[PDB]
């Protein structure tokens, strides 16, 4: 399941894509090599929606969601929202959350049961996200990192955080999330583990820079096998 994959010439897989347990987003630009690479592991179980967000190829960070729904920033155009609605499954809902922040994937990280949000996020947006995803919401930061989603990665299995996290912070995050937590690294020590790669309960994708020890750590924490 854990297979090495690369963008055109970028190791930031999660910037241009955002894999989920029931759907996957990929930038329309480039070539179908990324699309076919994701299809190989994903087969044809769920639709792989080629789509853009506000005309950018960073849709992976702009948007965020879970199995029960997908959230997009207000900057998203009407055509993109319509395409997402007509391509995503009926269970997944989409809405034009009217809040100041834009990068849901960077500012917010969540899984099918637990979601972390910015401490300053508006109450209405928090309630909407909770209703859409069917998950609990908690105000937290990873060792003072304002961009929780840019460093923290979380699925139903164990989670991964950037190495700078302290032992006490790692333990607190694991306790709050009720998931195994290991302070691993990806893309040759890159600190963008929360946004430079994608992973879910069955599939893990990362750049070629991920060394064999890093792949082994990812497999052990996520227990793909």
């Amino acid at each position: 399941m854990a297979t090495r994959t690369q963008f055109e010439n970028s190791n930031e897989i999660g910037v241009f894509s955002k894999l989920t347990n029931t759907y996957c987003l990929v930038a329309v630009g480039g070539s179908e090599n990324f699309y076919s690479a994701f299809e190989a592991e994903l087969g044809d179980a769920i639709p792989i929606v080629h789509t853009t967000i506000a005309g950018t190829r960073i849709i992976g960070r702009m948007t965020a969601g879970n199995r029960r729904g997908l959230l997009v920033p207000t900057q998203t155009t009407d055509q993109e929202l319509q395409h997402l609605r007509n391509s995503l499954p009926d269970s997944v809902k989409i809405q034009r959350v009217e809040e100041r922040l834009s990068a849901l994937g960077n500012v917010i990280c969540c899984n099918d049961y637990v979601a972390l949000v910015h401490p300053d996020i508006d109450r209405e947006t928090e309630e909407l996200i909770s209703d859409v995803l069917g998950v609990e919401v908690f105000r937290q930061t990873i060792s003072g990192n304002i961009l929780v989603g840019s460093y923290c990665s979380l699925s139903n299995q164990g989670g991964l955080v950037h190495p700078q996290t302290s032992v006490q912070d790692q333990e607190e995050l694991s306790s709050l999330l009720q998931v195994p937590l290991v302070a691993g690294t990806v893309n040759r020590g890159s600190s963008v583990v929360g946004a430079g790669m994608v992973v879910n309960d069955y599939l893990a994708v990362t750049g070629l820079d991920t060394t064999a020890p890093e792949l082994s750590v990812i497999e052990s924490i996520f227990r793909l096998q």
Binding site: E12, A103, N106, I146, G196
Partner: protein, 124 residues
């Protein structure tokens, strides 16, 4: 429309915090007789740290512009601009020194620098 000219004292945009930076040099500049380099939004430039952290002072590092403040005609007909010129600092491969960013970032700079986009929360 190109951005600030050479030597503009632009403000820092990273979370580490710096008073300002001096653009001593530009990369991919349009070298032409009487036409000085003008760093535009999203272009990686070598700018010295005029003021800031004591260790960062008196050394040139690659600065990535995140704001332009000037009117530029994007492929979209809207002539948008920003409050003031600002730019983050990163290594030649875009590895931003700071762990966060200050202020919003534009789509033009985010697209060219995936690391910067991952390092910013208020995009566009």
């Amino acid at each position: 429309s190109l951005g600030l000219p050479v030597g503009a004292i632009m403000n820092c945009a990273d979370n580490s915090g710096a008073r300002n930076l001096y653009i001593i040099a530009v990369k991919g500049s349009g070298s032409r007789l009487n036409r000085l380099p003008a760093a535009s939004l999203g272009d990686m430039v070598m700018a010295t740290v005029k003021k800031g952290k004591p260790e960062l002072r008196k050394k040139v590092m690659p600065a990535i512009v995140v704001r332009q403040a000037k009117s530029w005609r994007r492929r979209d007909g809207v002539f948008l601009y920003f409050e003031d010129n600002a730019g983050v600092i990163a290594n030649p491969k875009g590895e931003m020194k700071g762990s966060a960013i200050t202020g919003p970032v534009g789509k033009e700079c985010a697209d060219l620098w995936p690391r910067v986009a991952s390092n910013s929360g208020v995009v566009v």
